């Protein structure tokens, strides 16, 4: 049940389901099935649709019922993934070759990130680090969720660093992990943005981070004083839904009153004249509303 009633002048436009037009200060709106945003005689509230992609407003546009779909979102297919090392300028470079995955003095350190592909499978990719010489430390990856995947003889990149330990090449390398129960591989730029190799120190991992996950569930949803309508989602990222338009009549004394306080236009009022609130004929909503999902 959303509450957004104007004490100023403008009308909300509304229509019945026939398409027949009608006009309200009341803003009481309620989500019903059809996911419009209806009052309580069931008639649905109109404004400008949202087109392209990414969803923007035109200018151009017809009013229609607002909809709040409600449709479902896809998975999250992982496209980019961080891992923070600190590295010991001090570590041997083992003697142990070649590097295998299995043999655990054939490299200085490893590390984890569980990434998604599209169908939401996890992938845990291993990260191999094996000192090759002063500065420079070869990286191996593994996705150790497939089976098949072919075990890794060759590096994925090379981190090299300065005199002063920062990480001076070699930080961001595209992985393509393995395939799970006959599902797309993920694709996704690596970076080890910040990683440093200390004077003295053990191999450690500070920090991972991943974009991707499973199909999940967000947030909340805003109107703002402009009248844009927003959603908020679990992923940080917001998006436009719509916009409410607002009314204005040369002769609001020639309203028909249809009860409660809404309105019909009649030729005695003039037709609606539409904008929107903060711009021409219209102040700003005098604040908006905030609703959690």
Same mark, same amino acid.
């Given at each position: 049940?959303?509450?957004?009633? *104007? #004490? ?15 006009? #309200? ?77 299995? !043999?655990?003095? #054939? ?7 569980? $990434? ?10 291993? %990260?191999?680090? %094996? ?7 070869? %990286?191996?990856?593994? !996705? ?24 001076? #090449? ?34 450690? *991992? ?22 844009? %309508? $927003? ?63």
């Amino acid at each position: 049940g959303l509450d957004v009633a *104007i #004490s100023q002048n403008g009308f909300f436009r509304l229509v019945d389901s026939n398409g027949s037009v009608f006009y #309200s200060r009341n803003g009481q709106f309620k989500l019903d099935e059809n996911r419009n945003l209806v009052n309580m005689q069931g008639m649905q509230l109109t404004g400008y649709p949202a087109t392209g992609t990414p969803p923007t407003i035109q200018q151009g546009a017809n009013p229609a019922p607002i909809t709040i779909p409600n449709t479902l979102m896809a998975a999250k297919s992982t496209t980019t993934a961080s891992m923070q090392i600190n590295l010991n300028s001090t570590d041997p470079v083992p003697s142990k070759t070649p590097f295998s995955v299995s !043999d655990a003095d #054939s490299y200085n350190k490893k590390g984890t990130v569980t $990434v998604y592909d599209s169908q939401g499978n996890a992938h845990d990719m291993n %990260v191999y680090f %094996v000192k090759t010489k002063d500065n420079e430390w070869a %990286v191996y990856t593994h !996705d150790s969720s497939d089976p098949a995947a072919t075990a890794p003889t060759t590096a994925s990149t090379t981190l090299k660093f300065n005199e002063n330990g920062i990480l001076e #090449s070699g930080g961001t390398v595209n992985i393509t992990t393995g395939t799970i129960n006959g599902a797309t591989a993920a694709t996704f730029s690596l970076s080890f943005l910040n990683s440093m190799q200390q004077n003295t120190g053990a191999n450690n *991992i500070v920090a991972t981070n991943q974009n991707g996950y499973k199909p999940g569930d967000l947030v909340s949803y805003q109107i703002n004083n402009d009248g844009t %309508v $927003v959603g908020n989602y679990s992923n940080e990222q917001e998006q436009v839904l719509g916009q409410i338009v607002l009314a204005n009549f040369a002769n609001n004394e020639g309203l028909a009153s249809q009860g409660d306080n809404v309105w019909a236009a009649t030729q005695a009022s003039g037709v609606a004249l539409l904008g929107t609130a903060g711009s021409g004929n219209f102040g700003k909503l005098t604040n908006g509303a905030l609703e959690a999902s």
